[PDB]
Amino acid sequence: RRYQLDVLEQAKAKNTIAFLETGAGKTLIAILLIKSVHKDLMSQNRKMLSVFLVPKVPLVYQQAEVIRNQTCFQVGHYCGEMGQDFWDSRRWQREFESKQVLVMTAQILLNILRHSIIRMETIDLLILDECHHAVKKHPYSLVMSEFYHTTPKDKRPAIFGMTASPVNLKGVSSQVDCAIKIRNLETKLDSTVCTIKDRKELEKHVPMPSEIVVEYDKAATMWSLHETIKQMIAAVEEAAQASSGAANLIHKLRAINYTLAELGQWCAYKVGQSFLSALQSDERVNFQVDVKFQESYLSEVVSLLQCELLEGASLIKLLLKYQHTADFRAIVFVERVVAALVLPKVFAELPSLSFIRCASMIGHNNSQEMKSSQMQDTISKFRDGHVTLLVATSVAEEGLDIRQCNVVMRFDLAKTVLAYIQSRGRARKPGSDYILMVERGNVSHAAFLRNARNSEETLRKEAIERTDLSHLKDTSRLISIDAVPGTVYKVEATGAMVSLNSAVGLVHFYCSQLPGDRYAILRPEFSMEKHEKPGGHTEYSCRLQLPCNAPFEILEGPVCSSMRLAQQAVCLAACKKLHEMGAEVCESSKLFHSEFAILFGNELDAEVLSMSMDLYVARAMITKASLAFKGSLDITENQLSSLKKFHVRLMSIVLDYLFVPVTGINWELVEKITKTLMMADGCMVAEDLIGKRFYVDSICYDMSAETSFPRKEGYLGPLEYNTYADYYKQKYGVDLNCKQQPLIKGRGVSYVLDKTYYVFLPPELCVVHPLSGSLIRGAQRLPSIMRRVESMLLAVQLKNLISYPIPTSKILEALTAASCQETFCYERAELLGDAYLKWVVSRFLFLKYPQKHEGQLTRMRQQMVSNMVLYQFALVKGLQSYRVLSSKTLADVVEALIGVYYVEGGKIAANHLMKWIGIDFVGLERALKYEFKEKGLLVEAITHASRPSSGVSCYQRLEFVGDAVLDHLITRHLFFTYTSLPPGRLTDLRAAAVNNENFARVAVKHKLHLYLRHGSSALEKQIREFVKEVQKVLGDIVESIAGAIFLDSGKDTTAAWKVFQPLLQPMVTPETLPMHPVRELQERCQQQAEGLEYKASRSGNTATVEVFIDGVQVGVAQNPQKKMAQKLAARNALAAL
RNA sequence: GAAUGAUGCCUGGCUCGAGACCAUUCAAUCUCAUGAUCUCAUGAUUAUGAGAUGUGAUGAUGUCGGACCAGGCUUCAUUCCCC
């Protein structure tokens, strides 16, 4: 109607406070105005960004309904209550595209006010409710404190709020006139009030039900001696207090008192029955024993009283007049929720009319209630008509769409009569009447009804515009507006309050450090001391205790007059501290055992060249050597050009810088082969090659071409070619001119001697291809030598290193890829380089930060041990010059370089290449069988992330460094271990090295769980289990000792290395791998590996698995179902087979 | 010209089993409270939000082996060949 348009004018005009109950859908008109300013292309098109802020999340689901019900212009929502620490950044980055309206609660938006995000998020527009609550304790006031100065482009110029839904500010005697606290709040949020001005724009279609009072209950309440009974049971409770979760049961007693008081004793019997159900659940779940004792105490007292009140077993006729054609919509309003829970039982019980309830969400430790979703389910059931008859009953009572409820029954709710007027607008009145069953007993409800009357008086008073606004000027300052001025003056107050809130939240955040032993550890804590100074100068010593990771924040100070203010001041100390912290070619000849020779401009260096190199074939080894007799021997380059054409002819058509067999060079042979009836001669074919190419070792004259093709096998009857000239005639149509010549014993050059002797060739029927078979040997043996040559020229480039103690003859093996060309791998020096990598990165890292954080510098190490960084060190070298899919083992080759260049000289030259590319006490002492000097680092190692009431330091850093050092040390041993196993088996042994369990096994070789001091007893209980296993944190404190002696040794490994190695060694050669079962099973049944499901049941055995080749056995243990079930199955199988 | 088997190696994806680590989910925990009510007041009582921790499993991802098929190369036996 019209008043919507009027407040459209007033609100689009200026910042606006409206005070109208239901506003005829105030949020509707808010949506309309926001769509108006949206369709308007604003100055900044995203500055609009208006959110209706509520804290009520089922109401947020109503806004899901609403904001998808409207706003073709795009809008968003939250589930809320989610992990959104940095999520909000990309939430902005996506909301600027796709979410003009996003929904969130207040406190999240408060954290968004923190850290000075971009520019107050370009908001400039807002909708808000619960604005009456926006007071000193409330967040919204603290928002408007920093938002009072709407300076930057006026980031928050116009303000729109809703105080209509909660009108119970408290103070009708202080606010009999129209504006008292209203002036105060409208000066707070800087938004102008607009009142309803009249009821002419209301009540035309907004009827208000007449209020009907009742006297005393239709409850019986006819047992007054049970009041004295409950007074004696109150004395029982006083004994329970003098004893001192007892208080919850105490309040349960108070509750059942209220039930028996207000609704008779039969109802309190039903309440005792619900107490039996709740108390049965209490006796079930509760493991605490004093409280379970008092649960049994509850059962005896409640069985006494409730069994009396079963023999003892309101407003009913009110319900009954409304029962004929039951109410389409019914609302009942009471506070005590457990009574509301016990109603439908009684209502099915005596009058046989079904009833339903809506619970509240506040509860503790799996409290039986409707969840928020379950409340929405109940609401949807209420949207169904049958459950609407069942009735709706709650205590939250806000933000639902329930219309035209004929019966209003605020049964004994009078604290928020103004909120009831909310619930009165909730329903349009079709001749409906509100009903107020108040007991005629206890007449202070006369006072409550005149308070209601004064409430409508004050509503009528504010309905007159400015009835106490422009009226009081000085007396308003003597009433409350000098008590409520623009108090924003104190600048350290807002820094102090922000420091309070943020420092407690950051206390929580740094409490989320990494406890490990327990899910939550109380690392920050405090105690309070009344530091009242005689004279009225009360002070408060706030004693502040911190974790070890918090260095310099312990404060025990009578710093401020109030206790919470002293905590605010210690938060100020903390916030300052976290501002700080957190915030003529050389002739050289080749010999082997016309000899060969290379021709290159380069002169081979004697040291760089291997003295002899080896060759390995199926027959035998052949080794070779070279010698530079004539330095700069000169041959004519044109003859070189012709014979080079012949050399590439050898490569190209014969084999299909340059090598030479030298007799004194046999140039004439080179040129001869450059160009290149009858009787046979055996001497010409004593060593030859015959082009179609075959080897000619020897002949046979006894077998001639006229003789038969001997085929010993006669099953299929293969064609025995009666002459070999007839064999040639049958296949190629060829006959020999003189078939009497001997037959060539054939020898095959292609890539048991009887099959070789099978081939027989005719001399003329073959065009010789001219080479001696020994030179055939040499020529086909040339290519591996060329691979050797390219190896030694790479050795020319690389033996020419930056620095090199020894020649890089084994770097030749390091350069070659693992398992490539049958040659050796590089993995010993590789894993050695990896171990040194970890050791030296720990070295330089602690060189950087002895002020480090442990896991943070762990992240920094992992950053340094990122493969791509070492890939870039390779790039700034370029071992490429001696196609990477970005996932390559080239980093491992670099590691090989690192290890081998340690091996060539010292560690130090290896570090040069790195810079070239990259950059109880005596009891546990004798338990380790050792001696110790500085017990401070020992204390540092024994300190645990949990320590009983004491904190000095942490062992996590020492664990880190001893970890890296023993990586180095174990790797150094294992590559001093010259077993030279399969690299798979080398991988197995290094993996067997890395296991915290066997480090804990060393710890119980010294039994340090008896020696460790620790705050947590459940952690010791977990350790005592693991000790009973052997007759987790133990290996960790072992590494802390390792690091501690690394400090003691001045970063030396050898001294404590000597101590650890004998106890280290003798277990390693037995494999005894705990991943026997699944590895050995999936490998022992490659063809048929089948599997049965386990995770259906918890701890226990279920191992009738469908494996076939190994067989099917079941093995028994306490918890084998994770691992060792298949191991016990293999045990029973090998017992079976 | 080739192939067959057996023979080990290596590569791809797929899968199963352990590490690590990321997200989800539901419970829970602990703070932070905020309104109202008595209490001169403290204090007590009642309604309702924020997180963070978080149990389990889920989905991943990154290492590490399995198998599995798909393949490249080679020995040990032959069959066959090429003038």
Swiss-Prot record:
Residues 314-475 form the Helicase C-terminal domain. A motif (DECH box) lies at residues 129-132. Residues 7-184 form the Helicase ATP-binding domain. Residues 1076-1137 form the DRBM domain. The keyword Kinase does not apply. Mg(2+) binds at E959, D1036, E1039. Its main location: nucleus. Its EC number is 3.1.26.-. Disruption phenotype: Embryonic lethality in sus-1 mutant. Weaker mutant (caf-1) also exists. Mutant caf-1 produces extra whorls of stamens, indefinite number of carpels and show an absence of axillary inflorescence meristems and abnormally shaped leaves and floral organs. GO terms for biological process: rRNA processing; ta-siRNA processing. Residues 503-583 form the Dicer dsRNA-binding fold domain. Highly expressed in flowers and seeds and detected in leaves and stems. Found in ovule integuments, inflorescence and floral meristems, stigma of flowers until just before pollination, vasculature of the funiculus, and embryo. GO terms for cellular component: nucleus. The keyword RNA-binding applies. ATP binds at L20, E21, T22, G23, A24, G25, K26, T27. Its cofactor is Mg(2+); Mn(2+). It comes from the Eukaryota. The record marks K1032 as: Important for activity. Residues 677-770 form the PAZ domain. Residues 794-906, 921-1050 form the RNase III domain. Changing I182K: In sin1-2; impaired reproductive development. GO terms for molecular function: ATP binding; DNA binding; double-stranded RNA binding; helicase activity; metal ion binding; ribonuclease III activity. Expression in the early embryo is from the maternally contributed genome. Ribonuclease (RNase) III involved in RNA-mediated post-transcriptional gene silencing (PTGS). Functions in the microRNAs (miRNAs) biogenesis pathway by cleaving primary miRNAs (pri-miRNAs) and precursor miRNAs (pre-miRNAs). Functions with DRB1/HYL1 and SERRATE proteins for accurate pri-miRNAs to miRNAs processing. Indirectly involved in the production of trans-acting small interfering RNAs (ta-siRNAs) derived from the TAS1, TAS2 or TAS3 endogenous transcripts by participating in the production of their initiating miRNAs. Belongs to the helicase family. Dicer subfamily. This is Endoribonuclease Dicer homolog 1. The lineage of its organism: Eukaryota, Viridiplantae, Streptophyta, Embryophyta, Tracheophyta.
